[PDB]
């Protein structure tokens with residue numbers, strides 16, 4: 001009754017995406033899908049127009065599911081003969097939608113973490129706006145002065161700052177963020193943690209960046225005091241600012257069960273460290289949530305798995321883990337279901353997640369999880385299923401459920 | 402015959418520092434020491450002049466050992482009634498000396514890592530110059546335009562970049578780095594890895610910061626090709642650039658035995674994550690090495706342990722781990738010894754490190770390491786020694802050795 005926006009992708013994830021749709025989704029669910037092909041080739045052909053069209057379609061319809069895509073760089077420009085080094089589609093969509101990207105591991109009882117203390121999941125809430133990701137940078141090739149100016153819109157004295165006099169070359173960068181965006185990030189994070197009844201931590205480096213990072217600290221503190229502190233206390237949870245240095249140490253030590261609000265760059269980096277620590281990138285989920293909770297975009301917290309695609313391309317069997325991709329579909333459909341008051345669709349999504357977990361906990365799993373259990377040296381082919389075998393096995397149990 | 406420059410510090414580390422000197426160093430070694438008290442109180446009193454004097458003394462004499470110090474922030478300004486929010490002494494010294502800070506864990510056979518894959522130490526080489534640590538930032542409180550200008554020193558068109566038009570407040574920041582400093586960082590890292598015969602990785606985000614981070618990538622690549630590639634290949638090692646996202650995942654997965662060159666901020670953050678993953682900050686070493694290897698500053702890879710100092714202040718027994726601090730002294734004295742051709746001093750330093758490791762591997766250890774072995778819930782007072790008991794035990798075995 002509502003529509004689901006689908007964004008097709010690249011390389012190994014695109015092949016798996018087709019299998020997931022045809023095997024675990026379309027046989028059981030009839031939902032109207034608006035489709036956008038975000039393959040590298042179609043982005044180049046459409047001069048990246050598909051990307052922004054897809055983003056606006058998610059805003060219109062309320063829910064999107066996205067397959068991993070290639071982010072061009074020098075090598076990719078050569079590989080595909082790109083017209084331009086097109087921007088990351090993820091940055092474009094997240095820019096258009098706004099919001100915070102919540103990343104969380106999927107834990108199976110029988111798959112150990114790499115970190116021995118980790119008992120419960122940790123959620124990273126990544127601020128998907130500003131800083132490095134909309135920065136302007138340049139190489140300095142001659143002697144000269146880098147300075148910044150702030151120019152008030154009502155005339156009156158521009159403020160100037162001399163940063164550096166280069167003599168023998170270097171680099172320069174400026175970046176910004178906004179009160180509006182920081183306040184939206186804070187609200188998303190307080191709301192997420194409150195719904196979970198988990199505590200909340202914000203990491204910054206305000207110790208060095210007294211003004212830039214101090215703005216994050218002050219905005220979260222203001223918002224906690226005004227709007228959330230009483231509700232948090234009543235639920236037996238709390239919010240705390242932490243020095244980024246201390247926070248990464250805490251994360252190693254802690255058993256989990258907290259929400260961790262991260263600035264754009266820290267969320268990007270620490271999410272991968274977290275994912276890998278929990279066992280595998282194939283078991284890490286990602287959901288962008290707009291401020292208010294009414295628009296989401298769900299994806300796997302990993303890329304296109306091009307190393308595996310290379311093996312796929314030369315006819316070799318691959319056991320890349322489809323679980324995060326499937327959970328993208330289940331959580332997107334669950335959001336679609338709730339808006340639509342469709343309890344049977346919602347129950348289907350829960351049931352598919354349940355059988356995936358049951359399947360793995362009983363010993364049927366892809367090679368990455370076999371490795372977490374046995375160690376890379378000790379796994380043999382009979383210890384795991386290939387990707388299609390894993391998905392076929394899941395559909396079997398799904399059909400009895 | 403040469404002189405050792407000593408920089409006294411703050412809180413818990415200052416108390417331990419005195420005990421280390423009096424118990425494990427001065428009874429066995431006669432080296433001239435030039436002393437600088439970098440306590441919070443003496444930095445305030447001298448308007449931070451002691452800090453820069455101490456730094457220049459290290460440059461003059463070639464070797465410094467430093468105790469952890471307080472870096473002022475808003476709360477510390479109130480606590481000590483500081484005249485100003487003085488800059489981090491570590492940033493000041495590292496600024497004055499130049500160089501790369503190499504951070505490495507001390508592994509004991511019987512103390513497990515938190516990360517189950519970790520077998521050998523990892524060395525982080527932190528670039529101790531530029532980026533966030535010499536950046537200019539500001540809060541924007543009115544509508545206005547942030548722009549950057551590059552002004553060539555030979556007249557002729559300034560290059561201008563419009564970054565943002567603020568309407569409802571935000572933040573702005575500019576930062577730089579230099580070709581000279583990046584090239585010194587690269588050389589330190591290639592040399593360090595080559596002497597170890599370990600491979601070398603550089604992490605960047607050149608995927609987003611094409612110019613700023615691309616400069617790091619290009620400089621290391623240029624230097625490898627010109628100066629190190631053949632020597633690395635001949636030793637069976639290599640150098641590789643890595644996306645920071647991939648690199649933190651690699652670090653979780655890998656058994657260790659590589660050098661990891663990190664930009665200023667990444668080195669700061671990832672060093673603490675690494676340290677904690679290996680078991681305890683009390684077992685992480687830090688050495689600043691200038692480009693050429695002729696000036697060093699050695700310290701513990703941790704702060705003043707103020708949480709423990711708080712307990713110390715109210716007469717409670719503390720078991721803070723002195724090992725990193727002692728290794729600061731041993732590695733500083735070893736550098737002093739090599740310059741001076743003093744083989745007996747060098748052998749003493751090696752012997753003290755040896756007995757510290759032997760002491761722990763036989764079950765005599767501070768509370769942090771007991772916790773790594775037994776789990777926090779299961780440790781009881783008889784499982785560990787307090788700090789002085791640990792140091793006294795070490796001196797005992799040292800005396801028979």
Ligand SMILES: NC(=O)c1ccc[n+]([C@@H]2O[C@H](COP(=O)([O-])OP(=O)(O)OC[C@H]3O[C@@H](n4cnc5c(N)ncnc54)[C@H](OP(=O)(O)O)[C@@H]3O)[C@@H](O)[C@H]2O)c1
Pocket residue numbers: 067068069070071072090280281282283299300301302303304305306307308319320321322324368644647
């Ligand atoms: N959201 C997105 O659209 C997104 C996000 C990140 C990257 N990317 C793009 O994806 C492409 C490749 O990026 P990347 O190699 O840096 O990261 P990646 O695709 O996440 O793969 C990195 C490595 O992590 C492991 N891994 C990731 N997903 C896995 C899964 N489902 N099952 C098992 N193992 C998995 C694999 O290790 P082994 O090879 O050791 O098995 C893999 O080679 C690039 O073009 C990048 O731009 C897209």
Ligand SMILES: NC(=O)c1ccc[n+]([C@@H]2O[C@H](COP(=O)([O-])OP(=O)(O)OC[C@H]3O[C@@H](n4cnc5c(N)ncnc54)[C@H](OP(=O)(O)O)[C@@H]3O)[C@@H](O)[C@H]2O)c1
Pocket residue numbers: 243246468469470471472473491681682683684700701702703704705706707708709720721722723725769
């Ligand atoms: N090089 C330097 O001079 C330097 C470096 C960093 C920080 N600092 C300064 O040091 C002060 C405190 O900083 P911080 O609390 O962020 O970091 P910290 O002093 O490293 O202590 C953080 C926590 O790590 C654990 N830890 C650190 N060193 C330890 C040791 N030797 N033995 C056992 N456990 C240890 C303790 O955990 P538990 O409390 O859980 O036992 C401790 O509270 C601040 O004023 C900061 O500015 C100085």
Ligand SMILES: [Ca+2]
Pocket residue numbers: 268269646
């Ligand atoms: Ca990433």
Ligand SMILES: [Ca+2]
Pocket residue numbers: 245669670
């Ligand atoms: Ca630090």
